[PDB]
Amino acid sequence: MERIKELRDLMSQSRTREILTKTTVDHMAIIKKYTSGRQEKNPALRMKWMMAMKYPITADKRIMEMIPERNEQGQTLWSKTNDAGSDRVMVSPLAVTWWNRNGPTTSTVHYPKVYKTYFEKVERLKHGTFGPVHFRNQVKIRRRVDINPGHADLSAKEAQDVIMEVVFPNEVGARILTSESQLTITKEKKKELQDCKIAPLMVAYMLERELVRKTRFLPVAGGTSSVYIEVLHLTQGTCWEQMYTPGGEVRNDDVDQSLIIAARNIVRRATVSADPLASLLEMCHSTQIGGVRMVDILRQNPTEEQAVDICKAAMGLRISSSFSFGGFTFKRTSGSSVKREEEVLTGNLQTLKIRVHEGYEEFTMVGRRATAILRKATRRLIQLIVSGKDEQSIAEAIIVAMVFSQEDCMIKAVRGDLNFVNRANQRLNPMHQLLRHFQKDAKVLFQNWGIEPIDNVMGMIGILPDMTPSTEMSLRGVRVSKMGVDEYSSTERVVVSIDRFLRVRDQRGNVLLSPEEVSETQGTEKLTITYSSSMMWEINGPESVLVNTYQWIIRNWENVKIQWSQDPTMLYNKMEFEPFQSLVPKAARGQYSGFVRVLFQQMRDVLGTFDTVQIIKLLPFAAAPPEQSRMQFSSLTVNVRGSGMRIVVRGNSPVFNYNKATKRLTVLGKDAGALMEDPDEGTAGVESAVLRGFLILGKENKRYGPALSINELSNLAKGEKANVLIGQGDVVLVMKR
Amino acid sequence: MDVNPTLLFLKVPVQNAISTTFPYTGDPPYSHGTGTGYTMDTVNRTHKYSEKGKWTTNTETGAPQLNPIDGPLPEDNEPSGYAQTDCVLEAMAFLEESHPGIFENSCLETMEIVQQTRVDKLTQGRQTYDWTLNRNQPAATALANTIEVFRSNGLTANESGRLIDFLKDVMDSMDKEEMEITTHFQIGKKKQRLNKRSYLIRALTLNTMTKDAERGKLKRRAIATPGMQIRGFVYFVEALARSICEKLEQSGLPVGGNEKKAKLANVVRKMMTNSQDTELSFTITGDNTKWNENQNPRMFLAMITYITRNQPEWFRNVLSIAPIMFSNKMARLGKGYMFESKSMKLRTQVPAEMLANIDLKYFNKSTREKIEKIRPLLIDGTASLSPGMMMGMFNMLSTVLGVSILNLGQKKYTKTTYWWDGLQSSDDFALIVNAPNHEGIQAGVDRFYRTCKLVGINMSKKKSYINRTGTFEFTSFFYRYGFVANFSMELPSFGVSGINESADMSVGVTVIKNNMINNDLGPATAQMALQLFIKDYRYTYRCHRGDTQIQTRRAFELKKLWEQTRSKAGLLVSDGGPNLYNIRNLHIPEVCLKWELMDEDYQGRLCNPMNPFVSHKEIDSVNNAVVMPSMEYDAVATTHSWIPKRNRSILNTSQRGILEDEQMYQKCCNLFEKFFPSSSYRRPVGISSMVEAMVSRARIDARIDFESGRIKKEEFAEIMKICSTIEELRRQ
Amino acid sequence: FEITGTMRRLADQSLPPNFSSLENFRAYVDGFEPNGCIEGKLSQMSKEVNARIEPFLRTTPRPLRLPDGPPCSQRSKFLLMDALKLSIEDPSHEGEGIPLYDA
Amino acid sequence: NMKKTSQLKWALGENMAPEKVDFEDCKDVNDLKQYDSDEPEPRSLACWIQSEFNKACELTDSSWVELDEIGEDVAPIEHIASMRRNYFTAEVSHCRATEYIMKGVYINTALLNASCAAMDDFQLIPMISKCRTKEGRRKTNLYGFIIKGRSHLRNDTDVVNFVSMEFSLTDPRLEPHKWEKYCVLEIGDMLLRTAVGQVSRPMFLYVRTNGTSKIKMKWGMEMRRCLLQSLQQIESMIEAESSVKEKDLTKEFFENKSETWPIGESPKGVEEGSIGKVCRTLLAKSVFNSLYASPQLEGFSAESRKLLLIVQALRDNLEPGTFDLEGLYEAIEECLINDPWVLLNASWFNSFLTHALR
RNA sequence: AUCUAUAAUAGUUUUU
RNA sequence: CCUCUGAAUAAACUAUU
RNA sequence: AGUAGUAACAAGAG
Numbered sequence A: 001m002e003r004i005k006e007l008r009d010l011m012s013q014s015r016t017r018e019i020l021t022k023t024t025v026d027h028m029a030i031i032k033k034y035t036s037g038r039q040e041k042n043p044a045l046r047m048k049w050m051m052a053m054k055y056p057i058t059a060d061k062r063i064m065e066m067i068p069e070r071n072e073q074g075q076t077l078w079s080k081t082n083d084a085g086s087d088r089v090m091v092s093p094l095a096v097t098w099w100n101r102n103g104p105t106t107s108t109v110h111y112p113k114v115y116k117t118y119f120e121k122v123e124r125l126k127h128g129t130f131g132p133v134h135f136r137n138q139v140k141i142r143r144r145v146d147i148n149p150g151h152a153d154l155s156a157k158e159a160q161d162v163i164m165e166v167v168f169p170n171e172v173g174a175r176i177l178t179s180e181s182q183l184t185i186t187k188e189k190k191k192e193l194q195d196c197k198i199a200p201l202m203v204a205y206m207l208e209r210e211l212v213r214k215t216r217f218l219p220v221a222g223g224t225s226s227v228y229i230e231v232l233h234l235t236q237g238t239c240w241e242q243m244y245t246p247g248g249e250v251r252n253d254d255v256d257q258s259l260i261i262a263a264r265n266i267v268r269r270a271t272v273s274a275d276p277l278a279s280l281l282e283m284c285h286s287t288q289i290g291g292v293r294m295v296d297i298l299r300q301n302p303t304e305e306q307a308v309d310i311c312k313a314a315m316g317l318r319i320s321s322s323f324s325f326g327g328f329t330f331k332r333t334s335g336s337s338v339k340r341e342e343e344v345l346t347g348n349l350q351t352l353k354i355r356v357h358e359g360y361e362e363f364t365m366v367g368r369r370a371t372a373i374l375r376k377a378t379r380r381l382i383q384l385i386v387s388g389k390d391e392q393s394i395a396e397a398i399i400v401a402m403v404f405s406q407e408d409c410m411i412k413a414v415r416g417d418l419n420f421v422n423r424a425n426q427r428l429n430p431m432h433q434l435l436r437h438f439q440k441d442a443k444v445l446f447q448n449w450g451i452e453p454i455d456n457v458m459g460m461i462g463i464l465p466d467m468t469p470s471t472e473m474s475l476r477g478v479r480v481s482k483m484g485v486d487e488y489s490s491t492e493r494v495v496v497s498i499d500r501f502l503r504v505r506d507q508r509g510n511v512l513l514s515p516e517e518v519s520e521t522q523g524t525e526k527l528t529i530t531y532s533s534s535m536m537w538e539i540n541g542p543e544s545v546l547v548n549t550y551q552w553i554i555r556n557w558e559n560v561k562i563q564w565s566q567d568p569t570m571l572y573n574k575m576e577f578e579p580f581q582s583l584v585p586k587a588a589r590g591q592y593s594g595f596v597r598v599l600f601q602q603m604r605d606v607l608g609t610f611d612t613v614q615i616i617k618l619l620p621f622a623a624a625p626p627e628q629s630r631m632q633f634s635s636l637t638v639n640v641r642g643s644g645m646r647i648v649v650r651g652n653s654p655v656f657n658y659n660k661a662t663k664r665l666t667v668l669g670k671d672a673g674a675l676m677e678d679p680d681e682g683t684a685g686v687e688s689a690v691l692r693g694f695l696i697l698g699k700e701n702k703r704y705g706p707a708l709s710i711n712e713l714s715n716l717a718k719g720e721k722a723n724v725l726i727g728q729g730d731v732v733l734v735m736k737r
Numbered sequence B: 001m002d003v004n005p006t007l008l009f010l011k012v013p014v015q016n017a018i019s020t021t022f023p024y025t026g027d028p029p030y031s032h033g034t035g036t037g038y039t040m041d042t043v044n045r046t047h048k049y050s051e052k053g054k055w056t057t058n059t060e061t062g063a064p065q066l067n068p069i070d071g072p073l074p075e076d077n078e079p080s081g082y083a084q085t086d087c088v089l090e091a092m093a094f095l096e097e098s099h100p101g102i103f104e105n106s107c108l109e110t111m112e113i114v115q116q117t118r119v120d121k122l123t124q125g126r127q128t129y130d131w132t133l134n135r136n137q138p139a140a141t142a143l144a145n146t147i148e149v150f151r152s153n154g155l156t157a158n159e160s161g162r163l164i165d166f167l168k169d170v171m172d173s174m175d176k177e178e179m180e181i182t183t184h185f186q187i188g189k190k191k192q193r194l195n196k197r198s199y200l201i202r203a204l205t206l207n208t209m210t211k212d213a214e215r216g217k218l219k220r221r222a223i224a225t226p227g228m229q230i231r232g233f234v235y236f237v238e239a240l241a242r243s244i245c246e247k248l249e250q251s252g253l254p255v256g257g258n259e260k261k262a263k264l265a266n267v268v269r270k271m272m273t274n275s276q277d278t279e280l281s282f283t284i285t286g287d288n289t290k291w292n293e294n295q296n297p298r299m300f301l302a303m304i305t306y307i308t309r310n311q312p313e314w315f316r317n318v319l320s321i322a323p324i325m326f327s328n329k330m331a332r333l334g335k336g337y338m339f340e341s342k343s344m345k346l347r348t349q350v351p352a353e354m355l356a357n358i359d360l361k362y363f364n365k366s367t368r369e370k371i372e373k374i375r376p377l378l379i380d381g382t383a384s385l386s387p388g389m390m391m392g393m394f395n396m397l398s399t400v401l402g403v404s405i406l407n408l409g410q411k412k413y414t415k416t417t418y419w420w421d422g423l424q425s426s427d428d429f430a431l432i433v434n435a436p437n438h439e440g441i442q443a444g445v446d447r448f449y450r451t452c453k454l455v456g457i458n459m460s461k462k463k464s465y466i467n468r469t470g471t472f473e474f475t476s477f478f479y480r481y482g483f484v485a486n487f488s489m490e491l492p493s494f495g496v497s498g499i500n501e502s503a504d505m506s507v508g509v510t511v512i513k514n515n516m517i518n519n520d521l522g523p524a525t526a527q528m529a530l531q532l533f534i535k536d537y538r539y540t541y542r543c544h545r546g547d548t549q550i551q552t553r554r555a556f557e558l559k560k561l562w563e564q565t566r567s568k569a570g571l572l573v574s575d576g577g578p579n580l581y582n583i584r585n586l587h588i589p590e591v592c593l594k595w596e597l598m599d600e601d602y603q604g605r606l607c608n609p610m611n612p613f614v615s616h617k618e619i620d621s622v623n624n625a626v627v628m629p630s631m632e633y634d635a636v637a638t639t640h641s642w643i644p645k646r647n648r649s650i651l652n653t654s655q656r657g658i659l660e661d662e663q664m665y666q667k668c669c670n671l672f673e674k675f676f677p678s679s680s681y682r683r684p685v686g687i688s689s690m691v692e693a694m695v696s697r698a699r700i701d702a703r704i705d706f707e708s709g710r711i712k713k714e715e716f717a718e719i720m721k722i723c724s725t726i727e728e729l730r731r732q
Numbered sequence C: 001f002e003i004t005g006t007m008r009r010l011a012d013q014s015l016p017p018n019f020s021s022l023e024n025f026r027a028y029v030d031g032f033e034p035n036g037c038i039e040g041k042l043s044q045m046s047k048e049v050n051a052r053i054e055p056f057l058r059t060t061p062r063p064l065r066l067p068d069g070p071p072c073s074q075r076s077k078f079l080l081m082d083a084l085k086l087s088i089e090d091p092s093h094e095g096e097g098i099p100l101y102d103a
Numbered sequence D: 001n002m003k004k005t006s007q008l009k010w011a012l013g014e015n016m017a018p019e020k021v022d023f024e025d026c027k028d029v030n031d032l033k034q035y036d037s038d039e040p041e042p043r044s045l046a047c048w049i050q051s052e053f054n055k056a057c058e059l060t061d062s063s064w065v066e067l068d069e070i071g072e073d074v075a076p077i078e079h080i081a082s083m084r085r086n087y088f089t090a091e092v093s094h095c096r097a098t099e100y101i102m103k104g105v106y107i108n109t110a111l112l113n114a115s116c117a118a119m120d121d122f123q124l125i126p127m128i129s130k131c132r133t134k135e136g137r138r139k140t141n142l143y144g145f146i147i148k149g150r151s152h153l154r155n156d157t158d159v160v161n162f163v164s165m166e167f168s169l170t171d172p173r174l175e176p177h178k179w180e181k182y183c184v185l186e187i188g189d190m191l192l193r194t195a196v197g198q199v200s201r202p203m204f205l206y207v208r209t210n211g212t213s214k215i216k217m218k219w220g221m222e223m224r225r226c227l228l229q230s231l232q233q234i235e236s237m238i239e240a241e242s243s244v245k246e247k248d249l250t251k252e253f254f255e256n257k258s259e260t261w262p263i264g265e266s267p268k269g270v271e272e273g274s275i276g277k278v279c280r281t282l283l284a285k286s287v288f289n290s291l292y293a294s295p296q297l298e299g300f301s302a303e304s305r306k307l308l309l310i311v312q313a314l315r316d317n318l319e320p321g322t323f324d325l326e327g328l329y330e331a332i333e334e335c336l337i338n339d340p341w342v343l344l345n346a347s348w349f350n351s352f353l354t355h356a357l358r
Numbered sequence E: 001a002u003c004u005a006u007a008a009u010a011g012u013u014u015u016u
Numbered sequence F: 001c002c003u004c005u006g007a008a009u010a011a012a013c014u015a016u017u
Numbered sequence G: 001a002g003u004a005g006u007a008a009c010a011a012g013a014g
């Protein structure tokens, strides 16, 4: 009644009526920002200038009726002059501090509910636990982290729709909450907010603070969880790490992700050991995930992953030979495979590598609302049987099975602007990208998959690319049934035996898991992982492993140099090089070892040629069992975040670069320390640790004709000198021993 | 022993101490007087870079225009704007070849954006040249005035609420024989009639001025502000350019901060890995000289035409309008000059509209030469400036052009043993060149330089340098085997923002925390920064601790509050309390940090919704739940979230009446929020008038309440009667 | 979205030199195929337009040239090393007493 | 409020702006012409700026900064930070540059407050400072007086004039060229004890007219930022070493003084100082950047950064190359006109070029 | 595993 | 004499809300 | 005079 009376009063007047009539709802936004101008260009200078004035603050006229014009000492608190462009009056900060000490008192009991997030931050800080401070060589990586966790299974638009529905039921326009999660959250919040007495706008802002997920790119080390990112300024530094555990409750999904990462790292580093089982056991016993010992989590956490299963088998716990893919729990009943990196061309003219699994295999897929049995071969779907609830579930299962089969028809069905790199040019998992692309719309995938007549056996219904129940022809290899569940047996943890080399076997004697079946991806953990040992970098990422390996070699250069000179056999067997050897490509390890070792032998046979940098660079590559060969290497590769980064035998490289002006070593941009000059260094410009059977004598010598490539050095004989194009655009005269 | 700080670089590498080279603790340089000299210099220099072009007269405006496209090829290294159209088209074609489908998908996304965008998008920004007042006005004010004039001239497609309909209105206004506007004086209203050519000149005009507070420059420079007619077309073109740039690896836009650093590092390392192990690699840190004065709108028109092939004609037209308007642009001269008489000891202001036919005895040699050179271009108080992009516009399209030239460096295009790639950001670039030997590096650099010359891009020789791959500089980021921290760049952000007490406290602590996270600010320095910030805060807001004897007008009240309080730690710093911040709790609001230490009476007074220092809502009577005000850096509103006064200069001008208008607007808007509660939270969209929407909402609400039994039939009848009365008033 | 009237003429006056209509330019662009345009133009261009690299050696750089003239003079707002202070052992903290009383 | 006497009216530029009239009403004046827009007159470098910088880097026997309290330390990292902050505060509170920081902040704050509060009055503002002697007792110091002019400042570049009177013991006739803007009087005789005997020396009052704007005053009130710009850098250096040693090295650097950095030059050659000396030198450089801010300094820094990077690439064996090096030198030298601070920086750069490439 | 939602405010980068 | 007033470029990004 | 530097301030307007 007040609204309509006020509207009538405004419409009675002329200017107000003209504004209300000529202005549409769209132009209301334009006129709302209408102003004479906020002539402020230096807010700090303006504030300093204004605070010297008598009455810089603005207040509503009600203040004249609530606060005296003067305090006890007669100091004026406000004046009657209005603020230009409004009807508010001018007041002094003395008025604010007078109100804070003599104003009427209210009941501020619901503020913690309105601002629950900040008080939750306070509570998390209050109950947190502080550990020691460790000084190390931090390697922070720029990644996307979450600063506002929001709700687990919601996005920004979905959260906004839920907020509108809960707070503004009649203003939701045409939106309908179709997702199950959105409906459940809306019902729960309406139940919670039932009979609420807080203003709708503030309730909307509260729900925004509670539900909307916000993410940002930051240079992070440790855990990327929201609780660990709010105190990132406290826990990580340029040279130090503070051990700290938030005092709240920890989400289960974060624990699962951190456990998977830790298990993968531990298994990968254990494979390169001489006794993998004992190394794995000790590493598991020396690791904590978010302040909790890893063994407790392994006992009380039901995670289906290969590395976690290997750890459990090593600890004698029952495992499940299952993994996760596309939201379904796969379980290989029969068959075996070997991973192979294959290059493929995408439908939208993109070239990418994929980890193709060869061999014939049979799996059973279990989903929250679907189930299936799959039989496949190398990039070939032999057959699929799906028994989902409704059409949507069966379609989702079919899409997941098609992408899982690695069919060329699936790859060629990629359309649109699909990208396989991050917005920061970081590689993405091709399979996850394909799944996300085909889950939005699989019309082209189904159309290009193919059709085939069916035999009408057992009454199992068909399915067509249009997702309809046909009975004559159906999608190639796909059938729809109703009596296939076999879901109870999925959670049937079985007792297994683990071999010394981490080969899990069944009671019968068949191999279930092996280290080769663990993913090669190098991810990051949601919760901080703490390792307690002599080498706190033993299960770290690749960059940290590289920098710390070279820093360890530099720090112990005295005894390391003596040992290299005297008894090299024991030096190559140091436990410090094994994390580095894990990074070297497996098929190359032995080869590289051989190569490097030969160089060292020559470096000992020819006196006067002792370059510290060469030995330091090549030492980590001699830690694998050598394989003799005559191959010449100009660089040695290391797997860093899925890319093969090369280390050049001669000269500086992107990874390992040494600066003579400062005598400093930089590894991937991190300072590994300064080498200390030795009197035994050969100051004659002679290199004897570059080629397998050649000695570099000097710079280019035009006498011996034009230079030739490194691989064409096999034609020379004893005592023959030649010019070689060894190095980055450099030609040098060398001779063959 | 003479102290030489620079000698510190003999042991510390320059990058690792680069922050020492930024003298950002002193005040930055400012411009004092007029910007007419800089604008005239810019116009003359832009025409000098294209002097060998074709001179024509515009049949619609009459302004002389210079066309350097397809001009003579340069014979020296001076900057030149003789871009070759075929070369630009070929660069676009090869960019399409290397990234199939880029232009198609970009055009699809841009078509969606164009069809969805609303007119209110134009209200974004700070200032806008209002053609109805021949000066700058706030963007919303300029849009409102333009819409009002168009409605008065029978151009009401903008009522649809779509930006494209506003562009249709602009196009239709271009064809009007006359336009009629209103003018204010000493505060009467008078009518002014503009003929077709005068309005057309006004519509293609960009205002000019001088930039203030710029670091690292000895001399000042000019900047430009676009008009109302051209903002929408530029917005659509830049949306297309952004879509294109999002799909290129070499592009340094529109990414920034940590994400930009990560992208640049990934791209550089990928280039390094692709490099063979037996070939030299060099990196060029480069700058382009007078980038915006040599790029021509006609080449952007050609690029847009090539990008939008096989697209609907309406899309191509709406995209092509912007380069068309920008190649016929005019430049406002500025304030003018000032003259001084020493004998008579007097000063006077000479406007820039008189420069056309002002005697040249007053001016010195340099200004006289400027005026003589620029006079032929002067029309209707502006200068004809056809060539060049004025200032800081079409940045992403320029990025696309630079990235196309970079893409031309693949071996499939060079057809030789050298190749190149790199990073582009508007006009800044880093170029990695790989070749078997040094002569190959020289050949690659020369070919890149000449290919850039063909498309009108000049590499700054005196500001560019080349070294071995591993260190470079790009967009003020110093890469030394990885980007290094630079604290001095962000140092000016430390201090007191000047919003209010609560917001300033939050901003200070958050800035310290963020610089710890990002710029490698250490723990001890963070603590000292906290101490310094608290000191500055207390001195600025006169809120020293209550147990001190600092003489200020606010000290008596703080002393009384301190004496009457039992828990001192609960008091805010704004109330004379102590500082409880340290490293571990920099992420927590101050009020929340010490909530469990406040006295009940003090806490209630502080968080009292009925405090006149923050406004009150009107639901029921007043929302007496929380202190409610735009709450940036102010998590919890208290009595310390007050709002300071406003500048009162306009009170001495003829525009002061506008104040009334805006106030009245607020009034109306307030009423609209009593019918549609969600308007404040989310922006309403509709074509019906405000009164009609309010009346319809009132009727539907009355019906719903009566049906559900919330109100009695007497209220329903009264509401319907008042609605009918409002309907009657609407016609009268 | 059509271009007609003043806009069409402005468009016709926004093209490379050898084009007289917007539609003609669009027809030329639609049928464009890259056929050695850049290579031909590069061949035509003279060899004086080059980017010759000059090595920066230890003997290359020279000292900067400072200006000549009368010596520079003090310009700070207050004396720095030549300042003299009259002091009192007043037990007070920063900014507590009346400035004139202290003076 | 000082009375508007003729001497103050002249010294403070009273009624010195020309009358503002319309062009039509004065277009026929004979000598009417454009404002004098000549470039600044060149000046050559003198020895007094180097002495100023040398003195500004020295230690004092008084504490000039009393930093505010913070919360208690709970985490071990906070304890380590507090120890390092104690070292930093001990090093930085006893520096002459810190005295300059406090003096400038006080003077600019007083000038801004007077300018806002008293638009149309001549106010008397003493130049006061507070310190603590080595024995720990407070002390109040008077440097001189300032007289403010009218402050009807509209733009951020508008100038308010003032008269500065300051005590000194420096004879103005030893380096007259340094004091061209000053009128130095003699106001008394002061007795000073050298070792055991008193000596009488003249006491001079340096008097001059100066001016400042709101932007300059605001940036002078925020001079404490200088501290940060130094300490941050210093801490970085320390951290850069701890990483390679896996242990805190604050005590090792500050107390043992085992590691030194080249910080100056002598007739013998380059001189190396400790971490504290480097910190004080960087603080002095930042404070002088604040006190002598000018467009020339900005241009010189921006242009010489590139030459520093080229020399660094040369020192790293990265085979640097240039295209128009003479153009770079011209760009650098275009900024050296008359500012003592920029000229001294250019001399420092020349010294660095001499020492780096040898 | 992915992750460019909007709008307000301030700060930074983009010179012949 | 008296009254009033102490001055808001474009794009992108960063932080907070 | 002084600030300052390619053009201004050294109060403006009514």
Ligand SMILES: *O[C@H]1[C@@H](O)[C@H](n2cnc3c(N)ncnc32)O[C@@H]1COP(=O)(O)OP(=O)(O)OP(=O)(O)OC[C@H]1O[C@@H](n2c[n+](C)c3c(=O)[nH]c(N)nc32)[C@H](O)[C@@H]1O
Pocket: A256, A257, A260, A261, A303, A304, A305, A323, A324, A325, A332, A337, A357, A361, A404, A405, A406, A429, A431, A432, A517, A519, A520, A521, A523, E001
């Ligand atoms: O966050 C990452 C990971 O930690 C998380 N994850 C993994 N497992 C779980 C569980 N069980 N619960 C919750 N979260 C989990 O999901 C992310 C996976 O990241 P990424 O490392 O990139 O994926 P991965 O490298 O594991 O490869 P992916 O595509 O997900 O494959 C999963 C699994 O399926 C195997 N597999 C695929 N194909 C085509 C196979 C095949 O043809 N034959 C066989 N025998 N196995 C196949 C993958 O190799 C993995 O084993």
Ligand SMILES: [Mg+2]
Pocket: B285, B286, B287, B428, B429, B473, B474, B475
């Ligand atoms: Mg550059």
